[PDB]
Design a protein around this ligand. Sequence first.
Ligand SMILES: [Ca+2]
Ligand SMILES: [Ca+2]
Ligand SMILES: [Ca+2]
Ligand SMILES: [Ca+2]
Ligand SMILES: [Ca+2]
Ligand SMILES: [Ca+2]
Ligand SMILES: [K+]
Length: 84
Amino acid sequence: NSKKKNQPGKYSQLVVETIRRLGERNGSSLAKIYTEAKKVPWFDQQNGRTYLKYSIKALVQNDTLLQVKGTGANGSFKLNRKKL
DNA sequence: TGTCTACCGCGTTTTAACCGCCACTAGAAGCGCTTACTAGTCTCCAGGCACGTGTGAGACCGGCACATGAAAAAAAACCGCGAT
Ligand SMILES: [Ca+2]
Ligand SMILES: [Ca+2]
Ligand SMILES: [Ca+2]
Ligand SMILES: [Ca+2]
Ligand SMILES: [Ca+2]
Ligand SMILES: [Ca+2]
Ligand SMILES: [K+]
């Protein structure tokens, strides 16, 4: 209601598309998504880890994605919503 | 066997090692003189040794308490096997 949806960025979409792709039973990690997200040809190496860090911070706040536990450094996130 | 990236090789730009020199002087090192300190010698005697003896520390053993590994079995969870 009164909302006009965003269009999440090219890195913010990778978080969703990699977390759905190799969807762990519990908590897909920033380091794992980083490990294989960087095989993508358009990914820029020096900074892209920072962009997946920016993405998940917002993506968790959006009720788009949800994180289960801490582990190493609050680094385990599952895609919250599958619609009813 | 498979995946990821830390290492290697290389060309380019930067840095400071190197060399040869000169100027300055701290301090290494030699030398003569003097005495404090050590070796050496003698005499003496007590510290530390070989020897002997006892008794309590420790080794040994049996009985028990207790820690913990491994099995069997009960409870979670997870890893697929193939469906609209
Ligand atoms: Ca001197
Ligand atoms: Ca004595
Ligand atoms: Ca003795
Ligand atoms: Ca006695
Ligand atoms: Ca005694
Ligand atoms: Ca006694
Ligand atoms: K002297």
